[PDB]
Amino acid sequence: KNVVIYADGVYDMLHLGHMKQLEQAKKLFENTTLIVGVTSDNETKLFKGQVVQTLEERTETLKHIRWVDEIISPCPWVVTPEFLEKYKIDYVAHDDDIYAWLKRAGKFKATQRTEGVSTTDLIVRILKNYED
Amino acid sequence: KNVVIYADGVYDMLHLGHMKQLEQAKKLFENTTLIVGVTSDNETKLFKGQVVQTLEERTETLKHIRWVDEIISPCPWVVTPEFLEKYKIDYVAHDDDIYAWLKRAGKFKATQRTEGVSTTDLIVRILKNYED
């Protein structure tokens, strides 16, 4: 039976860390639909910080990712129970409390980040490790 | 009938431009297997220039790309006719002469780059457009 997974995020400058997280969410059960929510520029800036890529750029890259079945772009900043019913979502997948209500309901699936793999760190790599 | 497509490249700091190129190669015919060749650190440096990501890092990202069916990593720097027979490749897909022999044989499929979308340009974006 197919299980609908929802993974929201900014997905700015998508890197191997994001990709492994999406893979993990896609693979939480044998048969899934992975829906990915991409947060708006305005709300990301307002609640998180400056985004490098636009909503359109962040959404267009996700389309090329193997694990992504459906995209909600933009997505709401805060998951609600109405949202879960509206899109028939069985589990919310996110790094790990604003998610307590999901955990209480049995609908939270923790996914893990990967340190050091970010695009930021790859410029930091060529810096210090060259041009001195 | 399934058509085997071979697309080689450095695939350093994979960006939307690479992804659209891979999509294009994957979609050259109705049914394909897209094999992607990832060039070695040594030969890339020797023939092209410094690479940011290692062979392993460049190969691991490609695994997450929807369009990629198989990966040869590392791949030879120069395609040969023996290589085509060894992997049963029907067409080489590459941006557009070292490919004249492929074109002469009917086995070359040009794919297009996309300007401005590169990770280099996205740091250039936040620079000049901020921290002044």
Ligand SMILES: C[N+](C)(C)CCOP(=O)(O)O
């Ligand atoms: C924006 N949000 C509150 C829905 C989730 C935060 O997303 P990220 O912090 O995993 O990018």
Ligand SMILES: C[N+](C)(C)CCOP(=O)(O)O
């Ligand atoms: C390395 N090569 C000669 C096989 C193809 C060059 O690859 P790219 O220049 O498309 O990255």
